[PDB]
RNA sequence: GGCUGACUGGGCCCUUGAACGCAAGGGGCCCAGGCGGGAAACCGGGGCCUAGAGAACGCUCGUGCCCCCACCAGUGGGGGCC
RNA sequence: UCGUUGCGGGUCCGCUUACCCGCCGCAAGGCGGGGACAGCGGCAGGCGGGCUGUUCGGCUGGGGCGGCACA
RNA sequence: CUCGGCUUAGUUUUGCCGGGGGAACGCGCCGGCCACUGGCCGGCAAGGCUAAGCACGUCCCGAGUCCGAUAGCGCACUAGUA
RNA sequence: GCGGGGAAAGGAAACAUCUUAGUACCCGCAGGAAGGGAAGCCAACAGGGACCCCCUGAGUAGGGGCGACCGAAAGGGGGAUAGCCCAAACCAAAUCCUCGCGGGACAACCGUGGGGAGAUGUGGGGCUUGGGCCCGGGCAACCGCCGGCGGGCGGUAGCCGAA
């Protein structure tokens, strides 16, 4: 049982009571800080590592604060049938997590968004942590996971030659070891 | 099994919530030196994941926890785990200084002594002082292993 | 000639016990172990392997054995291996803005249902049929014209 | 004086709707079940006759040893035909 | 009304850190007041031509009023 | 899970967004057209990538029972010009 | 092509639910295609076996002033075919980036030194034919990085071509 398993207990029922006391003091500073701020370390380390966070050069973790509730649906100012005139209760098909990802993407232009997770809620605001990666950094390009977003290419000669070489040697071995059993 | 709502009911002033008792500078500096002696002669572990596994497995003798972890939930589980397994522990003010005594170029949030080679006597005396501190703070004793 | 696996069409309740066969996705692992190969060796030789399939059919085994003898006796040329021969992964720009992150996938419904049953799929599919005037969209109200015509003629 | 036929399950015909398409409603003649009046014949499916009359969806009630509900069985619930 | 909403004490009293309001300060932060109320989000009832969409039948000695010659 | 809303064939049963509530852990969890119970069957969500085979026409090549200067693109021409 | 915001006219022989239509249009973001894609699947006790697109299933099931109208999926036939990784268990800095120099097909990489990241975990391992852990045997081990040298072919001007 890794330390990351114990880290999650503050967001489980066993540690929720102590954690909400911590958030009541941490949230005071966050409400005063800028709406989008870069952070040195993720607030939920175990959650961040699952979604692909690593402490490599070029990985950015940004904390995003935004107002909760349904989106600002606008009352139409022109003629509409009665079904299309309502306001209260109508929401967007986007969630605030995707909205928080897009806002973090704007502040770091050119960086790609990897993932994000929920952090905290208060009466007015919701807080997310967005993992963005620089696809131009050398230490990000060769990552086994980060090359899925930053692109990857292998020449066909590399895969075709080795697969051909494997098939030549497998057929040589199967003739001496599998052919007598098959014929028999 | 210990409820964190009771073990962390009364936090100390100007400290993260996982700190249970005040550690004087001379006891904290001593506990840093034993980690250096244990690394130099016997066997130690550094890093939160490695030190957590030691407490689970029962190979831990002293656990050092830094007070300056920025998200405190990275190491807040360690005191409850140590009290679960009856392993004595002590707080240290700086994770950068803990990492230096552990022999690594980076900070360590926590470290544990597995085998105190030439610090066997000093480790026992250190536990007595920290145990005396624990009694003053309404805490039961945790004896040397 | 590479042999093709022969699997059973799933016998439905509507069928009433009438059954037929079809070309399966690939040779099952149980069928391959009766000829001495695993999935890696079979794909290296060029056979199509389906590790998901659990059933074993003797007709599938015999076709494997006859073909394997010709290959190992140098009387047949095996095809290229049934493994990826190219790796092309493009750089992704604006994944968050095109709804391709986890939150966007959840909002689109790909976590909870299939792509064909998602709502954005249904919008695009019905638009293509109407644009091209395809099967049922070539006539609007085709069901109601059919229903009333059936009453009038089959009265 | 004695009763409840203002009955249960069905069919055919006339009129509404001329010859000539076409609701609902109304009337007539009967078959079966079970009754009432009467010695019996016979009559009774409201008022001596011609007016007082209402589709689809939905709901509700009655009825059936009734049918169905997604792999199988059961419980609650739902749907179906008249 | 649900949440924001917390800390003590015996539904009520109090407290301040939440929150809110103003003053000073680039900001950092300080001062004053209110105060777990308010304000804010969700849900629910009321008033609601402020605004949006519509309907305002037919016959008919022309239309309208009348009448129903509309079953 | 519940409430509001948009959407869906999804109907006491589609997906999602918002407000409030809110698990478990492989001895567990999920699905099998209302819910629950038992059996049986199939699986392992909430992390990422992936060629081929499919849309399009600024552009290039070819074809035509197409039009033939009031036709055919608005423009066969110092036309998106005057 | 992908995500979000989002009508009305008209239709229903009026009209409000509804349809029109998630359309017109708007905002944002990519590629030469995009998106989807590798079973918490479908089935029914018989079996299929990632995905997309085409034919069909089918105007069937179902939705709906059960009106107008709307409307699948599984399954079958085809085009094509391909499977993998991150995290965790276990080990604990064995790691990666940069630059100087020497070497090295101008490359990768090797040696050496400075700097940066990294115990809040770099790296190894692992990916349903679950894995980790322990034990024994065997190589046809396996998995990655560079694209130098040689050759062939095609495109971007042309040349010959009977009477
Ligand atoms: Mg309209
Ligand atoms: Mg249609
Ligand atoms: Mg009539
Ligand atoms: Mg007539
Ligand atoms: Mg009368
Ligand atoms: Mg009448
Ligand atoms: Mg079924
Ligand atoms: Mg209040
Ligand atoms: Mg209010
Ligand atoms: Mg008005
Ligand atoms: Mg009217
Ligand atoms: Mg008139
Ligand atoms: Mg009048
Ligand atoms: Mg002319
Ligand atoms: Mg012209
Ligand atoms: Mg039109
Ligand atoms: Mg109309
Ligand atoms: Mg009109
Ligand atoms: Mg652009
Ligand atoms: Mg593609
Ligand atoms: Mg793609
Ligand atoms: Mg539609
Ligand atoms: Mg690691
Ligand atoms: Mg010539």
PDB file of C-alpha atoms (C1' of nucleotides) in Angstrom, chain C residues 7-11 13-14 20 22 24-25 29 38-39 41 43 50-55 57 82-86 90 93-94 97-100 105 108 110 114-117 120-121 123-126 128 130 134-137 140-141 143-144 146-147 150, chain G residues 1-4 20-23 28-39 41-60 67-78 81-84 128-129 140 142-143:
ATOM      1  CA  UNK C   7     -16.770 -19.181 -36.335  1.00  0.00           C
ATOM      2  CA  UNK C   8     -20.430 -19.632 -35.462  1.00  0.00           C
ATOM      3  CA  UNK C   9     -22.950 -16.869 -36.025  1.00  0.00           C
ATOM      4  CA  UNK C  10     -24.543 -16.149 -32.611  1.00  0.00           C
ATOM      5  CA  UNK C  11     -27.795 -18.106 -32.486  1.00  0.00           C
ATOM      6  CA  UNK C  13     -33.886 -16.377 -29.898  1.00  0.00           C
ATOM      7  CA  UNK C  14     -35.617 -14.946 -32.971  1.00  0.00           C
ATOM      8  CA  UNK C  20     -25.006 -20.538 -39.942  1.00  0.00           C
ATOM      9  CA  UNK C  22     -19.126 -16.943 -40.833  1.00  0.00           C
ATOM     10  CA  UNK C  24     -14.468 -15.016 -37.572  1.00  0.00           C
ATOM     11  CA  UNK C  25     -12.179 -12.207 -36.514  1.00  0.00           C
ATOM     12  CA  UNK C  29      -5.835 -19.067 -28.467  1.00  0.00           C
ATOM     13  CA  UNK C  38       1.034 -18.594 -29.019  1.00  0.00           C
ATOM     14  CA  UNK C  39      -0.350 -15.241 -30.150  1.00  0.00           C
ATOM     15  CA  UNK C  41       4.320 -16.586 -32.884  1.00  0.00           C
ATOM     16  CA  UNK C  43       1.017 -13.104 -35.593  1.00  0.00           C
ATOM     17  CA  UNK C  50      -8.340 -13.165 -31.634  1.00  0.00           C
ATOM     18  CA  UNK C  51      -7.341 -13.504 -27.981  1.00  0.00           C
ATOM     19  CA  UNK C  52     -10.884 -12.554 -26.937  1.00  0.00           C
ATOM     20  CA  UNK C  53     -12.415 -15.709 -28.421  1.00  0.00           C
ATOM     21  CA  UNK C  54     -12.661 -18.725 -26.131  1.00  0.00           C
ATOM     22  CA  UNK C  55     -14.235 -21.402 -28.340  1.00  0.00           C
ATOM     23  CA  UNK C  57     -13.332 -25.480 -33.626  1.00  0.00           C
ATOM     24  CA  UNK C  82      -0.124  -9.294 -38.281  1.00  0.00           C
ATOM     25  CA  UNK C  83       1.468  -6.602 -36.126  1.00  0.00           C
ATOM     26  CA  UNK C  84       1.774  -2.812 -36.411  1.00  0.00           C
ATOM     27  CA  UNK C  85       4.281  -1.846 -39.097  1.00  0.00           C
ATOM     28  CA  UNK C  86       4.013   1.954 -38.761  1.00  0.00           C
ATOM     29  CA  UNK C  90       0.359  13.512 -34.774  1.00  0.00           C
ATOM     30  CA  UNK C  93      -3.350  21.170 -30.829  1.00  0.00           C
ATOM     31  CA  UNK C  94      -6.245  22.458 -28.754  1.00  0.00           C
ATOM     32  CA  UNK C  97     -10.927  23.317 -27.071  1.00  0.00           C
ATOM     33  CA  UNK C  98     -12.101  20.390 -29.225  1.00  0.00           C
ATOM     34  CA  UNK C  99     -13.463  18.425 -26.263  1.00  0.00           C
ATOM     35  CA  UNK C 100     -10.907  15.613 -26.404  1.00  0.00           C
ATOM     36  CA  UNK C 105     -15.296  12.970 -23.393  1.00  0.00           C
ATOM     37  CA  UNK C 108     -19.926  13.992 -25.018  1.00  0.00           C
ATOM     38  CA  UNK C 110     -18.163   8.452 -24.541  1.00  0.00           C
ATOM     39  CA  UNK C 114     -20.885   3.968 -27.268  1.00  0.00           C
ATOM     40  CA  UNK C 115     -19.898   6.381 -30.005  1.00  0.00           C
ATOM     41  CA  UNK C 116     -22.832   5.275 -32.168  1.00  0.00           C
ATOM     42  CA  UNK C 117     -25.316   6.016 -29.374  1.00  0.00           C
ATOM     43  CA  UNK C 120     -23.345  14.208 -31.339  1.00  0.00           C
ATOM     44  CA  UNK C 121     -23.099  11.061 -33.459  1.00  0.00           C
ATOM     45  CA  UNK C 123     -26.860  14.630 -35.057  1.00  0.00           C
ATOM     46  CA  UNK C 124     -24.094  14.068 -37.605  1.00  0.00           C
ATOM     47  CA  UNK C 125     -25.538  10.810 -38.939  1.00  0.00           C
ATOM     48  CA  UNK C 126     -29.037  12.168 -39.564  1.00  0.00           C
ATOM     49  CA  UNK C 128     -25.527  13.155 -43.678  1.00  0.00           C
ATOM     50  CA  UNK C 130     -30.629  14.304 -45.263  1.00  0.00           C
ATOM     51  CA  UNK C 134     -30.187   8.548 -48.387  1.00  0.00           C
ATOM     52  CA  UNK C 135     -32.277   5.479 -47.485  1.00  0.00           C
ATOM     53  CA  UNK C 136     -35.156   6.685 -45.316  1.00  0.00           C
ATOM     54  CA  UNK C 137     -34.470  10.414 -45.652  1.00  0.00           C
ATOM     55  CA  UNK C 140     -40.083  12.766 -45.464  1.00  0.00           C
ATOM     56  CA  UNK C 141     -43.061  11.213 -43.732  1.00  0.00           C
ATOM     57  CA  UNK C 143     -43.795   5.945 -42.433  1.00  0.00           C
ATOM     58  CA  UNK C 144     -47.109   7.794 -42.393  1.00  0.00           C
ATOM     59  CA  UNK C 146     -46.939   3.801 -45.839  1.00  0.00           C
ATOM     60  CA  UNK C 147     -49.318   3.383 -42.904  1.00  0.00           C
ATOM     61  CA  UNK C 150     -51.692   0.021 -46.111  1.00  0.00           C
TER      62      UNK C 150
ATOM     63  C1'   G G   1     -13.468  17.889 -39.468  1.00  0.00           C
ATOM     64  C1'   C G   2     -14.045  18.636 -33.688  1.00  0.00           C
ATOM     65  C1'   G G   3     -16.359  21.365 -29.046  1.00  0.00           C
ATOM     66  C1'   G G   4     -19.867  25.066 -27.329  1.00  0.00           C
ATOM     67  C1'   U G  20     -38.688  22.730 -38.757  1.00  0.00           C
ATOM     68  C1'   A G  21     -33.747  21.459 -36.050  1.00  0.00           C
ATOM     69  C1'   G G  22     -29.459  20.687 -32.741  1.00  0.00           C
ATOM     70  C1'   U G  23     -30.740  23.163 -38.611  1.00  0.00           C
ATOM     71  C1'   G G  28     -13.630  28.583 -30.177  1.00  0.00           C
ATOM     72  C1'   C G  29      -9.942  24.652 -32.116  1.00  0.00           C
ATOM     73  C1'   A G  30      -7.232  21.027 -35.742  1.00  0.00           C
ATOM     74  C1'   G G  31      -5.708  17.900 -40.078  1.00  0.00           C
ATOM     75  C1'   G G  32      -4.718  16.674 -44.881  1.00  0.00           C
ATOM     76  C1'   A G  33      -8.337  14.208 -43.480  1.00  0.00           C
ATOM     77  C1'   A G  34     -10.658  14.808 -38.776  1.00  0.00           C
ATOM     78  C1'   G G  35     -13.227  12.454 -35.214  1.00  0.00           C
ATOM     79  C1'   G G  36     -13.808   6.906 -33.326  1.00  0.00           C
ATOM     80  C1'   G G  37     -11.014   2.821 -31.745  1.00  0.00           C
ATOM     81  C1'   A G  38      -9.025  -2.255 -28.411  1.00  0.00           C
ATOM     82  C1'   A G  39     -15.061  -4.877 -23.612  1.00  0.00           C
ATOM     83  C1'   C G  41     -19.351  -4.992 -24.794  1.00  0.00           C
ATOM     84  C1'   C G  42     -23.281  -7.837 -27.249  1.00  0.00           C
ATOM     85  C1'   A G  43     -25.825 -11.933 -26.329  1.00  0.00           C
ATOM     86  C1'   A G  44     -28.766 -16.090 -24.350  1.00  0.00           C
ATOM     87  C1'   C G  45     -27.057 -21.071 -21.728  1.00  0.00           C
ATOM     88  C1'   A G  46     -25.667 -21.338 -28.612  1.00  0.00           C
ATOM     89  C1'   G G  47     -22.035 -18.259 -29.393  1.00  0.00           C
ATOM     90  C1'   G G  48     -19.584 -13.562 -31.202  1.00  0.00           C
ATOM     91  C1'   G G  49     -15.108 -10.732 -30.310  1.00  0.00           C
ATOM     92  C1'   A G  50     -11.355  -2.751 -31.092  1.00  0.00           C
ATOM     93  C1'   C G  51     -12.845   1.014 -34.489  1.00  0.00           C
ATOM     94  C1'   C G  52     -14.738   3.739 -38.652  1.00  0.00           C
ATOM     95  C1'   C G  53     -17.224   3.848 -43.369  1.00  0.00           C
ATOM     96  C1'   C G  54     -20.764   1.242 -47.317  1.00  0.00           C
ATOM     97  C1'   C G  55     -25.426  -2.328 -48.206  1.00  0.00           C
ATOM     98  C1'   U G  56     -29.130  -4.260 -45.022  1.00  0.00           C
ATOM     99  C1'   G G  57     -31.821  -5.004 -40.543  1.00  0.00           C
ATOM    100  C1'   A G  58     -35.897  -0.530 -41.375  1.00  0.00           C
ATOM    101  C1'   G G  59     -39.526   3.319 -41.479  1.00  0.00           C
ATOM    102  C1'   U G  60     -39.043  -2.564 -37.758  1.00  0.00           C
ATOM    103  C1'   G G  67     -51.575  14.057 -34.261  1.00  0.00           C
ATOM    104  C1'   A G  68     -48.377  15.961 -37.864  1.00  0.00           C
ATOM    105  C1'   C G  69     -44.359  13.627 -37.882  1.00  0.00           C
ATOM    106  C1'   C G  70     -39.927  11.536 -35.679  1.00  0.00           C
ATOM    107  C1'   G G  71     -36.985   7.159 -35.241  1.00  0.00           C
ATOM    108  C1'   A G  72     -32.651   3.137 -33.541  1.00  0.00           C
ATOM    109  C1'   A G  73     -29.661  -0.982 -31.924  1.00  0.00           C
ATOM    110  C1'   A G  74     -28.090  -6.037 -32.004  1.00  0.00           C
ATOM    111  C1'   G G  75     -27.461  -9.236 -35.950  1.00  0.00           C
ATOM    112  C1'   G G  76     -25.896 -10.441 -41.437  1.00  0.00           C
ATOM    113  C1'   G G  77     -22.963  -8.963 -46.108  1.00  0.00           C
ATOM    114  C1'   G G  78     -18.405  -5.812 -47.381  1.00  0.00           C
ATOM    115  C1'   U G  81      -7.335  -4.959 -40.559  1.00  0.00           C
ATOM    116  C1'   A G  82      -3.093  -3.893 -35.449  1.00  0.00           C
ATOM    117  C1'   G G  83      -2.472  -3.522 -31.256  1.00  0.00           C
ATOM    118  C1'   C G  84      -0.282  -0.879 -27.273  1.00  0.00           C
ATOM    119  C1'   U G 128      -6.518  -9.810 -19.553  1.00  0.00           C
ATOM    120  C1'   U G 129      -3.560 -15.009 -22.240  1.00  0.00           C
ATOM    121  C1'   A G 140      14.173 -18.668 -32.356  1.00  0.00           C
ATOM    122  C1'   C G 142      12.847  -9.176 -26.080  1.00  0.00           C
ATOM    123  C1'   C G 143      12.276  -3.871 -26.303  1.00  0.00           C
TER     124        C G 143
END
